[PDB]
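Morning!

As promised:
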Amino acid sequence: AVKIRLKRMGSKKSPFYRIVVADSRSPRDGRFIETVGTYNPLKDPAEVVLKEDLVLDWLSKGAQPSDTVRNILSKEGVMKKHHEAKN
Amino acid sequence: PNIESAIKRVRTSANANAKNSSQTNAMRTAIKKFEEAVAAGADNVDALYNEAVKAVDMAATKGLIHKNKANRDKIRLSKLA
Amino acid sequence: SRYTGPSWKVSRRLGISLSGTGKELARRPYKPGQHGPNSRGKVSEYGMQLTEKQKLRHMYGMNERQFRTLFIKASKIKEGKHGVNFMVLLEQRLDNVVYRLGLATTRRQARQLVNHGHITVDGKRVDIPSYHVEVGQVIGVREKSQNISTIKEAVEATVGRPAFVSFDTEKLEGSFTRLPERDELYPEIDEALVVEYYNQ
Amino acid sequence: RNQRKVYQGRVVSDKMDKTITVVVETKKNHPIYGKRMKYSKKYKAHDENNTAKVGDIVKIMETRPLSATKRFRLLEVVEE
Amino acid sequence: PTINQLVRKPRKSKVEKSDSPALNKGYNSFKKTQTNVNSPQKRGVCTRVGTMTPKKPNSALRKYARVRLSNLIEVTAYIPGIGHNLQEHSVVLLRGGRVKDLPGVRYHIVRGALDTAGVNDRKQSRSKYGTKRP
RNA sequence: GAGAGUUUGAUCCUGGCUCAGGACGAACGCUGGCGGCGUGCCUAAUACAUGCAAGUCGAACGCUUCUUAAGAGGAGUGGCGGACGGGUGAGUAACACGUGGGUAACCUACCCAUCAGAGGGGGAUAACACUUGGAAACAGGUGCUAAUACCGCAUAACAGUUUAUGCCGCAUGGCAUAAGAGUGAAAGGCGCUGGUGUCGCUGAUGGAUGGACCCGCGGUGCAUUAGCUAGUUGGUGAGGUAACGGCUCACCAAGGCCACGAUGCAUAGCCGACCUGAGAGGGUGAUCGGCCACACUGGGACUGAGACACGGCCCAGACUCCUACGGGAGGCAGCAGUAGGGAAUCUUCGGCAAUGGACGAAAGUCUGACCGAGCAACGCCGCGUGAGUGAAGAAGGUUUUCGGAUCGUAAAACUCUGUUGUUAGAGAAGAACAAGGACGUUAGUAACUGAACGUCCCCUGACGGUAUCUAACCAGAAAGCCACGGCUAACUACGUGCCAGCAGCCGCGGUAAUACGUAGGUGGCAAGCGUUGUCCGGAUUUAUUGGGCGUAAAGCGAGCGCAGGCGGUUUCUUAAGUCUGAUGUGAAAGCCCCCGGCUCAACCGGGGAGGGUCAUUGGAAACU
Ligand SMILES: [K+]
Ligand SMILES: [K+]
Ligand SMILES: [K+]
Ligand SMILES: [K+]
Ligand SMILES: [K+]
Ligand SMILES: [K+]
Ligand SMILES: [K+]
Ligand SMILES: [K+]
Ligand SMILES: [K+]
Ligand SMILES: [K+]
Ligand SMILES: [K+]
Ligand SMILES: [K+]
Ligand SMILES: [K+]
Ligand SMILES: [K+]
Ligand SMILES: [K+]
Ligand SMILES: [K+]
Ligand SMILES: [Mg+2]
Ligand SMILES: [Mg+2]
Ligand SMILES: [Mg+2]
Ligand SMILES: [Mg+2]
Ligand SMILES: [Mg+2]
Ligand SMILES: [Mg+2]
Ligand SMILES: [Mg+2]
Ligand SMILES: [Mg+2]
Ligand SMILES: [Mg+2]
Ligand SMILES: [Mg+2]
Ligand SMILES: [Mg+2]
Ligand SMILES: [Mg+2]
Ligand SMILES: [Mg+2]
Ligand SMILES: [Mg+2]
Ligand SMILES: [Mg+2]
């Protein structure tokens, strides 16, 4: 299915991730549908940039967050907005 | 084969093939009988038409044919009636 | 790679004093080697362009690849003379900044202090002699390294400093308060000839 | 509703029943020398009733494939 | 030409050719055909080692080797430096490069590679002639 | 937007040749300290030893073997996955690809959303138990046994089609409504309390994703390749497909294509991009991403939502292997590795912690994807191999006009430094989690458990004691390579005497050679330096930008003329070309521009810009 997941970037021993909407079968660093955020885990408080309306729109369409992206979406409060949208 | 699942798929697909082809032949015979009735001009042609339509739809169930494949047959069958 | 060879023979190859004092050119103001004292043919224009370019990179003790790349970036500066903007970027090199502030008598000494880590930029240690220093950044000596004769001799020995530098003789902390203007740097260096050298 | 491509052209063959061959005759600039060069792209159109005759200007609209080489439908006969 | 002529018959440029063609062709044993592979060097076997005479201005006994390459091409090569240990049936590595004196010689033999020895007594430009630092 | 050398006794011009620059998946020669990042079979799509590269589910189902009935296996059936990920580029000049469109000719598992259902039965079948044959692969025989396995019946037309109406389009037509005829599904598991939670199951629809097909335009050489085509071109029906269609067929016509390059031949995966160039261009298509194609060679279908399916099946073939000769087995262009070819490309390593993928409710299992580590200066970037003072200038080398020069402030000496190195110590981020234990809020419910969400506790590092940091100790272990006649930065001695040798070009060597070999100096670059190969430049040397044809290469021996190219003045008009505005799109990464992060840089991240002879649409109207 359509996943909201992390695409690895950066350099060796210095990972940087973009949050992307992608088909599950596409390679991790390969084809993707749309970029919706970034995730920098090297920061002691992790830096996240999120296009919340884009993420919220895709979740309503059935996109499945990956495990770590779901945590990222909860801290930013998007997973609460999606819960209230379903209500 | 080399992988165990592949070995098992050989059996399951072989079994599926036997079932699929038997039921598909059933559908073809049912159709065949109706069409031959139309050529002869029989009396129970109505029943054979119904059974022919029944066989095609049941074939669409179980997915031996595609829904559009079934619909084309049903339209074709009705024209023969 | 650093040039660790004799220093005088480099200055007399270039016909200028790289230390800016003249002790290298006082005796035997001619090229090194046995053919130095007696007369040779006229240098070509390519040799004139080569020597001018070699003046600068010998001045700041850089290898040629680094010198080329810095010269390329100096081109990207849209406003101002290509050669002038190049001379400023050489000055902003942390090496040169240390020597200009007076913490070393020679640029080799300034490089040795930067390389070995006795210098701190904005309170933070930097050991890259090639490090490029912005205007207003503070260049200081490490708190462990402030009491070494070599810097203290240099601090007291240097009686003059460029007008574009601020310095505090107690904190051992200084900064360029603006970019050097062409007249403030070496006038004897014809940067126009360097620009044409790399133009070829 | 989206639109298909419609081209103006000239009938150059009607020896086939229910079909015509059309020529569009555009002009393209040469990629190197920049001069405008004549270029003929000709199409097969399904003529419903063999109406349009040879040497006629006709408009054709694109459609689904009607045969091996048919992709266009006669729309108008603009000149006879 | 007019513009219309250039449209009709566009400009076409002379095709260049290699100075060392024998290095441009590989060989496939299976298909028994020649492949177009650019190679900086090529190994060959010395079918004949001898001496040759130069063209008119110069006079010497230039040392060559008739080398059949691994790609089956038969080439005449030059043995640079003073003194050499080559003999017939030796395995030698060839580089490109003509010898202006010898009309038919388009390749030099690499010293210090394969069966070719370094130049005895060499002390300057050793990387050429393939001699280790003394 | 730099030029130089070389035709002559000299000259101007023309003209080729050659060189100074940049680049590389390079190789080779000499040399070699470290670190960051990237790169590494370009040849034989050659043959491949060995291990590994897809499995998972006991909360679908029945057995079986233990554990002192718990727990743990073992194979069945069944479900999903195996058509992704990874590799290679052989084939392919072709709607393959790129870009712009179209489909009122399309399909779509898993994921979301909605409206419905989920009712009654039935006969089996492995596993198992014996037993037959076989060397082995493996086949059978009989007797049992379950399901979310299978099959009927029932109930569902919201699907398709027909018809009537209305609305509408771009021709076939599309949408809604209404009726009408004919037929069509399913399954239970776990857990709370017949009801109900939750995961599954069936029907229809919409979404999203993925796929399919059609079309415009664009990107190789050769006519010393012009003819090609016969299901070929079109039609009419039929059949077939998810779908239009000669997709197939039977008939009826005969057309279709082509000098705007058909056909044939040769070569080639294409692109984003990369190298070069002032640009126009030229060259290339490694690594990374997209698309395509292929998986021992050829053909075929099965299964499935999806494959005509790298680690599936069948057949044929070539090859290797095992046989008891009857018959069996196999496919590294997966990760390593071996042989072979070659000038030339790596460890048969660690880990699943991270990220992503399969299965599961989950713990979790699997993952040579991927994260890491190893090897190579293969590339790029950074830092070193010391710093300061230091003689009218030691010894020694080279050379002298024997005075002195030069190597040389170089060395020595004295004072310093610790990037590094060594010794000890101190020690990261990368982890977010999930699961689980607490409470809470919503919707629903008779009430619940639970679902969705929110808050706390708890929980996990392959790298690895890695980066990094701190302290002590010593300049101690850490530089070469090429060049020096002109081009071209850098010059003298000997040795040799057209010899030996050099050479990119011009040219050097014939007994006083800055050109051969050595030495001392010197120049360039530096952990590299040079050589060779290849591409662009210089080359205006195919000239569109940007050249020529009296005598240097070049006007057909001359006419007549088809096509084509070009074409006098003007009114109105159009608006294809041209110009212009807006919108759509031209992925990400990359160059470039700002902006931040790594001590700097390389490198990384963010925000832009650029890029089309693109389409749709509104304008202008001189010029064609
Ligand atoms: K299974
Ligand atoms: K000459
Ligand atoms: K010339
Ligand atoms: K499957
Ligand atoms: K296209
Ligand atoms: K037809
Ligand atoms: K290919
Ligand atoms: K094939
Ligand atoms: K497979
Ligand atoms: K994992
Ligand atoms: K395994
Ligand atoms: K995790
Ligand atoms: K020379
Ligand atoms: K021209
Ligand atoms: K004439
Ligand atoms: K117009
Ligand atoms: Mg953290
Ligand atoms: Mg370096
Ligand atoms: Mg030499
Ligand atoms: Mg290969
Ligand atoms: Mg090929
Ligand atoms: Mg079932
Ligand atoms: Mg039924
Ligand atoms: Mg040019
Ligand atoms: Mg394999
Ligand atoms: Mg240290
Ligand atoms: Mg010179
Ligand atoms: Mg010499
Ligand atoms: Mg040109
Ligand atoms: Mg003549
Ligand atoms: Mg002439």
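Strands of chain C lie at 119-121, 124-125, 139-141, 165-168, 173-176.

Hope this helps with the figure draft.
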